[PDB]
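Entry: Lactose permease
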Amino acid sequence: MYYLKNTNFWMFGLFFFFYFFIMGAYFPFFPIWLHDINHISKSDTGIIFAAISLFSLLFQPLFGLLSDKLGLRKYLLWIITGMLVMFAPFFIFIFGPLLQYNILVGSIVGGIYLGFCFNAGAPAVEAFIEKVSRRSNFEFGRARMFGCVGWALGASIVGIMFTINNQFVFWLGSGCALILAVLLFFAKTDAPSSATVANAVGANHSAFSLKLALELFRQPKLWFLSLYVIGVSCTYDVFDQQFANFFTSFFATGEQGTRVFGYVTTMGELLNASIMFFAPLIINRIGGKNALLLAGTIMSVRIIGSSFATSALEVVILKTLHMFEVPFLLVGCFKYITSQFEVRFSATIYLVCFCFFKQLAMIFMSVLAGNMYESIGFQGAYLVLGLVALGFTLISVFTLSGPGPLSLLRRQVNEVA
């Protein structure tokens, strides 16, 4: 139907689809790729990962601001397909060596650029395409739902295909990636047809500045919100970022372990949906302040649930919980902002609370983590984190902003209307 008949939908709906592919392999593959393939230690991982954050802090905000100056011009998005394409040559040949030849610090720093194409780019493709949904009529809403398949599919193929010949996966990831990427540029959308001439007319924009900021810092709620996010996200993320390798100890063999991961992740999103389809209701029925907490508690239990874990199946049950928090956090976080915050602050909030303040924490905790692992052992460290995690989750409970601030029905109308 119109949403399936038109050009761009079909087109980009695929673009979505093949992002998750390369991204798929990437994320999981990564940790694994380090161990079996790159005999990576903790200090190494720890920095590799943490370092990445640096660029997920310095690169992406400037990249999101270029999006506006760019309006709906393809130029930048290409700069993505471009660097994405040499994924294999880049990875196989650049990292391996800078690392394997024994020179870590460089490979990382120097390595986290083609390595950026998957953190900014995400909100990037996620973005651009969105603007194109306002041009033709079909909401990215179903675009993402279409795009998420790829994520699901790849993962599964990764595990299998990975262990069989890692050098291979890259090839197909990068390949189908490039081929279909470029394939998708030649068929685009350039001028209006009643949808206004100026780029500033349909999608509009959001802005920020020192006073907003200074005003925000005047606010106490940020402090207490940031603890949550900064404390819990950092913690939890760090964890999930290397958790896998651990998960990999629990199996019959290196080969089978990896597979499982593939299934999991993939079987995961199917849970994501079921959840979010109820998320809103759940949330509004419950409230933001809460959403976050329940979400955070989950994670805590997911961690603490690792120092007392022995079997693989046991881990399986521990991963899963990943999905249980996804919805809740995204949703909660988002709705909790709207609910206890002056809409004018949105953009700023993210910028300050989520980019300059979350990523920063990671660069540090990541490294600390790494070491801790090396020097104490997975489950060992875990106590520290998971504990610190639960404690911070608790504190937010007794401290986060009212579940029904000094005027909930009125403002609950703000979200409804």
